């Protein structure tokens, strides 16, 4: 929120958080300090009737290191648009890939979940991605209410140096090439959704002959999800397959995985919202003998108390499920639980 | 700019802007999503009936690389100062060194052009310039503005050369100064001078293989139409061990010139035509005389409103590939740039 | 100061400055421009009557490199939090060890003091650290006026991989295991003020093994310090005694240091304000034959001119007293005079 400027048709909204946040687990690449901030600028100009300029950014920063530590600080939104009325809107930038108009639904944990467990950033279009124009659609042409689409593309972001270079260049993990998706969700009751979503990117060079760990031509996602958000109650799911799209850790790509979320939260009127969910990614013929592996399985149990629009606390216990192997060894997967704490002041 | 602060003779104005920006080119260094924004804040405080105090910062952020790609945000300028009323002003800090007083006149492409090209920042005074110290007169002591600007010296990592605030040869600088004189002969027509002397480092004159000299110097001069929605403007610079001859070092002597013209439509549409070249002469290496750049540069802006526009900008580059500019790594290329732009 | 947002019970106060600053000295790793901005927020949301909850951002951001250097940012401080009346305060995140709610009296130098002097950043409890859990009472409840005191704990910030390590790893010199720490200050008058301050952490593995000098399990400090502050006069002297807490340069820490810090200043009615000081660093039982050192020693002496609550001027003249010598050489430790002007616009 926080409404900075209005002044002849032109509208600034500074927004952002501070996180501080402790994490507590065997596990010590995750164990300890995490407290973070974030800060945001939406921007919106009139320019006609029909027709409405806008712009966002939104910069992550972390506080948990030194003040002589590197690489702290990134962009993790930055767009330009226009809106064309109920004939859609059109931006390009650093924006979400479609498919998380779908696999949102169920990014709604106290702490965990979302970008970072099934699916990551800088992961074809399955999260935030650089370079996407994105056309969406609401109500259908003003038509039917409720029904909102969305089309999208994906120029390359390609290696470094060599033949397979672009400016932007990239780890193999977090290089694409062009690529598009589409999504669509209906309110099918008030309270009630249904979506879906699908993707197809072209892989790179790198990508089929760095790592050891997923082979083809084509990534491809295909989302179903549900979301019942009413009476104080939310529940949604989330079911994704994809090929040669979601990461082994860090020894590559499966060629086929299957990813579900479920979730689980009621709103008290005095402000605490207790959640529990499921999360897993199961990983199909991979090869160097590894064949079928869990890469993430987890019950989560927290919750979160909000004071007020402005600020809240909550905890989050993950349970991890996953049994240590060879696999989540050497693709430094982490198999240990976490308890997170953290207090929260939004604006 | 957005005024997000005014009160007791204290003012604050935050502006910026997002540049969805996408380049096509057969350079793979340059092709690809070049998505970007600034964020700055102008600030003064009246202190007096004559002299207010003045602070900018702009900050540029990349957006066109991933959440774990690192350097993608760096400070363009930041700079503090006191203003004495209409007899001028003085300001201390990272600013556009004089130079580009005159050079800013052709630095109006919808996309390209300005530093990069003929000049570059941490140039010496020819762009954004780490410690200059710069006053400025208005009407000197009438319509005729002279700045006069010292540089201290910014050098090498580590060894003799060293200051705290070290860098490579390619933008380090000795104890320079500069001085510019623009003037509007007619109402509409504006001619300008500039010169900058600078002494160069050791490290200037030992690491690359192109340029020796114990100073950079720049001449300046250019002219600029700005009426009756018709903009020309163009500026000629010679220098001497003060321009970069690519990776390769500085030529010992270089001639640049930029000369553009555009038109602005009332429904809001500007196209645009520039040319631009820089001429490199006794070079080391048996280089010889050698183009650094040169192309033409076609393209257009449409202005939504002052807050949004969009734009396309097609430079036609006509360098020959030869030893020259694969050594240097200048590209040779076509590039056509599209953005979508959201500014505040 | 600069209030740009007040609504609903939600304020934000967005402050900072930039600092026109250049450094004159033989010591050519501080010679030069050291022009550098902050900026920052800070927050406040009222709850209910009894509870208002806040957080503060402050970020640096050097202007004194290049366009393609590195590191040039970093956050100073980030912490979310909530103020329970005069049952006191809770906050979490990077914040200030309450060693410095004393040593702070000191830090009114033109340009130099303060951290890099005698203490530095993630130096334990010293002054700016990750991942403070701090309790702060003032008043003592309400029931003794001018009476304040606080309870602080950090966890362990570790290294960056081994045993040792925690998620937000850094080198041994800014290393830090479990600790805690207290203050207290007391105002007699309404300008003549005492105050103490204990810490005590837990020493790293690598903080043993790595550097050349200081071994020990522990970290403690102990700082008593005295304060005038009325009558347009300021005078603060603070004396801390430090185990194993105390930076010998590079090369490690100090077995035993005491630390001294002295200031005089005077406000004139026009704006000038002339400051002197004296600091002094004496480190003991050093190893590799070093004993008994000076880790630092000066005199300083200069002024700023307020032209008002938005910008002044200063000059800071930093006489050194330390011999060049085999420690001050082989620990980076500068014996150099330095001189500083600037010009400084804040909001």
Redesign the interface.
Known sequence: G????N?DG?K?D?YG????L??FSDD??????????R?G?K?E?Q?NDQ?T?????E????????????????????????KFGDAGSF????NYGVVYDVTSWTDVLPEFGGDGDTYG??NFLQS?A??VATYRNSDFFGLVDGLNFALQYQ????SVSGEG????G?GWS?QNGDGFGTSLTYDIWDGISAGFAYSHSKRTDEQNSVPALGRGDNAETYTGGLKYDANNIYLASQYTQTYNATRAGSLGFANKAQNFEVVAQYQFDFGLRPSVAYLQSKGKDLERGYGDQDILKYVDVGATYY??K??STYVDYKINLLDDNSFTRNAGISTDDVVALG???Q?
């Open positions: 926080a409404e900075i400027y002044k032109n600034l500074l958080k501070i996180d501080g402790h994490y010590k690449s995750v164990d300890g300090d995490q407290t973070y901030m800060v600028v921007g100009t320019i027709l300029g806008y712009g966002q950014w910069y992550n920063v972390q506080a948990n290191n030194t003040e002589s530590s590197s690489d702290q600080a990134w962009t993790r939104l930055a767009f330009a648009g226009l931006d390009y930038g650093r950033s800088d935030r650089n370079g120029g390359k972001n390609g270079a672009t400016n932007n990239r977090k004071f007020n402005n600020m207090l929260v002041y604006f």
